[PDB]
Write a protein that binds this DNA or RNA. Structure first.
Lengths: 38, 169, 207, 141
RNA sequence: AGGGAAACAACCCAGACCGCCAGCUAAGGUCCCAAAGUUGUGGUUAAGUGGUAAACGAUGUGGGAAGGCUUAGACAGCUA
RNA sequence: GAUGUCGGCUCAUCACAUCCUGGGGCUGAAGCCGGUCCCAAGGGUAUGGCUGUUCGCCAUUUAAAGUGGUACGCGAGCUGGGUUUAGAACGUCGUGAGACAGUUCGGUCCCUAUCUGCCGUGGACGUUUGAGAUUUGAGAGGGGCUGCUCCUAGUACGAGA
RNA sequence: CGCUGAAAGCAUCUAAGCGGGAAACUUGCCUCAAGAUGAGAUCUCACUGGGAACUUGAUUCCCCUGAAGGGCCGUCGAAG
């Protein structure tokens, strides 16, 4: 995870999810583009 | 298009029980599937099964779709034996308990509940068989966190696919 | 379940290999069941016992009638033992036989009354200096609290007074010897209290 | 001069509230209203002209929204650091009647009269109460 | 001075001659502490937001304008 | 018509922006190590040489020697080394009395606790007739740390180390 | 870190529904604890006499009777 105040889709495989009230990003390619809240 | 208006198309070997509020699915190769169908839901009958909502909400719009999905894999698991081929290192299957020594000093023994069953078709592999995909996927995940896949050389228990992120140092 | 005895002082045992094991010897005159408290009639499961010999003129009529329901003819004190699932009739006699050797055990008595201790003896405080200019206060506590926030002393502040006869349990003491012919437990180590104080010996809570 | 109720000749009744899916504070406000005696024309503010309230199913009481996992209950033990909390659902597992008592207690006055009115509230846990001799009748059916 | 803003010279309403177990209002209010709507109609809001707050970041949701992709068969998913 | 400094001692108490110990994610993380970021405040969290020191610099340890609030916590608990009244001296300034981005030796720390607080320990009354004993536990407090050698195994991993 | 899973034919730990998960939290361990005025519970013991006035939870007064037990006191304590 990577905690910001501004999560973005860093590449094309990134996907933004509201999970449990948190704006997370899941990446199917690289787990370094996983990022927590924003 | 949306999935709740896609009918179930159950085969002949699924003898259901309409009860008004909750569905009860019986059949051969597994049975006894009960599900408390929610309040915002319609369960009607024909030659095939199909679902519709009750009221103009965005909460029940997700619920009718998940109810069609739950009864889809519920019916097709009453019909067929839901599987998973987890590939690991060393599997001494013996009975209702599973025995595997994943690189520690102790071989951690894993027991299997009612429903599920695991087999030993090869040397490095586990095939699972169960009637609901919920518990099939749950016991596959419960095997998986015994040892997650190390990227570098590659050790642990995997899935059937190969999308494991490998790195070189 | 446990047993009630009195502390007869400490002794020693040499083993044959040559280690001296420190031993307190708990003399257990055999304990006599007076009630059996059942959850139906009392709310919980327990057993009352007695350990011997009060005078007749020191047993009151209420106490003598309680000791005469159970045909026990009974003595100093009455103690209680919470039970899980054990059945005792109200005349039974539990002895040292419920202990083997090995057999880790918890022993509770009343500690020796130190009278009114100071903060050095009661709470292991440091003394201030004895010579380097120090005025009258060489052994007193230091400050109590902080200045105006909070402007009062916090509760549970460690101060002085009565290191006394509180109940103390000493747990996981090994049983060296169960001597049932003259009714003795020999117990590895120290036990709270003076010689002849009442002491309660029941199996270990941390097993 | 106006009427004053006087504590010798006050009439009291016994009542059973069935808290089997009632909102917590909307139940508590009618309970506290009836403990003070606000529903009686003989209301005098310095005498308790209230009724005895029995509440039976006090773990079936219900909070709305997310107040079940939320809604902390606090108490300070008196020692430093000794703040202590419990949420709604672990309190309704531990002591279920304490919920519907600290709701009604906070809505009563902070007086010796509020204590005397709180003594007339008898909340219980199951579907029964040990008060069949006082013969309570059901309200807000 | 009084009433309101929990408490609060200077903020709001209002300027106390005295008595009344009379009425109507202002500010502010009307579930219980605590006087008065658990009032009515139509919505919004799921955070306890209300009941602390900025750059910026979010398929959170309501509304209103517009474009083209719109069955010769579109936006992601199977038979060269 | 007085709220008596800096430091040390003694005793603390809270926060968490976590120093150790615990749980994770990513990695330019092969492993021993790490880097960073989350979660976590339960318990722990040096002794000294120098200087009045806080700090700092060293010496040697530790698993670690956390950062802060509390009248820069704490003198009706102690000290009184520094600043610091009156004495004296040096350098400097001033004709001088004297003075100091200054140094230097010397130099009185009062209180028997009424009330709140806190640690103990009783006396009264009440608990619905009274009594001797034994109790349940709503609640509250304490406790909670950690190192090393070995045992699978010089194995898994790594060309090797 | 997830299973199943839609809204959004897919994918997604989540929106329903189910799991793992830390010295934190609640127990477990020790001690105090019914002044817990919500004053709880057990076992056992003790008391089984008349009359008058005035007001009839009835109180007051007189006579008799003072039990279970508690205390004062004494000899003391590894208790103070």
């Amino acid at each position: 995870m990577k905690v910001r105040a501004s999560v973005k889709k860093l590449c094309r495989n990134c996907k933004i999810i509201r999970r449990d009230g948190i704006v997370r990003v899941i990446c199917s390619a690289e787990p370094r583009h996983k990022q927590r809240q924003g | 298009s949306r999935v709740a208006k896609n009918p179930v198309k159950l085969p002949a070997g699924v003898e259901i029980k309409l009860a008004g509020q909750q569905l009860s699915i019986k059949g051969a190769k597994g049975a006894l599937e009960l599900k408390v169908h929610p309040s915002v839901e319609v369960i009607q009958d024909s030659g095939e099964l199909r679902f519709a909502a009750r009221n103009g909400d965005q909460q029940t719009r997700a619920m009718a779709g998940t109810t069609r999905a739950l009864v889809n894999n519920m019916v097709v698991g009453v019909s067929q034996g839901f599987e998973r081929k987890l590939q690991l290192v060393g599997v001494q299957a013996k009975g209702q308990v599973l025995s595997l020594s994943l690189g520690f000093s102790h071989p951690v023994d894993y027991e299997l509940p009612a429903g599920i069953v695991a087999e030993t078709p090869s040397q490095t592999d586990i095939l699972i068989k169960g009637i609901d995909k919920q518990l099939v996927g749950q016991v596959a995940a419960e095997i998986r966190d015994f040892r997650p896949p190390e990227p570098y050389k590659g050790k642990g228990v995997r899935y059937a696919d190969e999308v494991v992120r490998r790195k070189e140092a | 379940i446990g047993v009630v005895g009195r502390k007869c002082g400490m002794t020693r045992i040499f083993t044959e290999e040559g280690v001296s094991i420190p031993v307190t010897v708990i003399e257990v005159e055999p304990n006599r069941v007076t009630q059996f408290k059942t959850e139906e009639t009392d709310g919980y499961r327990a057993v009352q016992v007695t350990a011997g010999e009060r005078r007749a003129s020191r047993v009151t009529k209420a106490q003598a009638g309680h000791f005469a329901k159970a045909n026990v003819a009974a003595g100093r004190g009455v103690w209680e033992f919470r039970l899980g699932e054990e059945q005792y009739a109200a005349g039974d006699q539990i002895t040292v036989d419920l202990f083997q050797a090995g057999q880790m055990v918890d022993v509770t008595g009343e500690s020796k009354g130190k009278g009114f201790a100071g903060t050095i003896k009661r709470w292991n405080f440091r003394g201030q200096d004895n010579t380097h200019g120090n005025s009258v206060s060489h052994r007193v506590p230091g400050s109590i609290g902080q200045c105006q926030t909070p402007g009062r002393v916090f509760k549970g502040k460690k101060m002085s007074g009565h290191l006394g006869a509180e109940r103390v349990t000493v747990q996981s003491l090994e049983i060296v010897r169960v001597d049932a012919e003259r009714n003795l437990l020999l117990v590895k180590g120290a036990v709270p209290g003076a010689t002849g104080g009442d002491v309660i010996v029941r199996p270990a809570a941390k097993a | 001069k106006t009427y004053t109720a006087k504590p010798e000749t006050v009439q009291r009744d016994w009542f059973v509230v069935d808290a089997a899916g009632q909102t917590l504070g909307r139940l508590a406000t009618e309970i506290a209203r009836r403990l003070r005696g606000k529903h009686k024309p003989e209301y005098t503010p310095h005498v308790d002209t209230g009724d005895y309230i029995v509440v039976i199913n006090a773990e079936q009481v219900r909070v709305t929204g997310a107040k079940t996992t939320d809604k902390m209950y606090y108490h300070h033990s008196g020692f430093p650091g000794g703040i202590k909390s419990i949420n709604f659902e672990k309190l309704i597992a531990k002591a279920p009647e304490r919920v519907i008592e600290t709701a009604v207690k906070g809505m009563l006055p902070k007086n010796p009269l509020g204590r005397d009115m709180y003594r007339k509230l008898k909340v219980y846990k199951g579907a029964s109460h040990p008060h069949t001799a006082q013969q309570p009748q059901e309200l807000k059916i």
